[PDB]
């Protein structure tokens, strides 16, 4: 079990970028997969990304990222603080809803939000 804390929200001017951070705690943020998620009033929380615990390669962890915002966020991970950041670029309108970042041990099924075990409180991103 672990709990997690989103950070770095608030009100942003369109078309410049914001760095969203999630720590972990009571548990290492090393030892779960851990995605990030977006829901805009009255709907349901979007999948937009995944880092993996372990590597693809020399130096990547496993990362995934929705269509939507592929190419846009930058999804990292900095177990030596307990903490893993996304990095939003070129923000709009659009991008305007409370970010959750949320934590779970498998492999799979990082699309859909009921899979994940634990969840922040989420913060408030409008621009
Ligand atoms: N090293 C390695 N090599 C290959 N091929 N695949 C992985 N996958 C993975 C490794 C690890 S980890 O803990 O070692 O880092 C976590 C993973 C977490 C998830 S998620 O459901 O939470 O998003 C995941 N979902 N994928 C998909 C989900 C939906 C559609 C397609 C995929 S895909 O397998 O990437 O193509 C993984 O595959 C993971 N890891």
């Known amino acids: 079990x672990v709990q997690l804390q989103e950070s770095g929200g608030g009100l942003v001017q369109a078309g410049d970028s914001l760095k969203l951070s999630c720590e972990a705690s009571?548990?290492?943020?090393?030892?779960?997969?851990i995605g990030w998620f977006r829901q805009a009033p009255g709907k349901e929380r979007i999948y937009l990304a995944t880092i993996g615990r372990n590597l693809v390669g020399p130096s990547d962890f496993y990362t995934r990222y929705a269509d939507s915002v592929k190419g846009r966020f930058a999804v990292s991970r900095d177990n030596a603080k307990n903490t893993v950041n996304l990095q939003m670029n070129s923000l709009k309108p659009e991008d305007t809803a409370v970010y959750y970042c949320?934590?779970?041990?498998?492999?799979?099924?990082?699309?859909?939000?009921?899979?994940?075990?634990?969840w922040g409180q989420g913060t408030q991103v409008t621009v």
């Open positions: 009571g548990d290492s943020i090393g030892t779960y997969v």
């Open positions: 949320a934590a779970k041990t498998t492999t799979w099924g990082g699309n859909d939000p009921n899979n994940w075990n634990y």
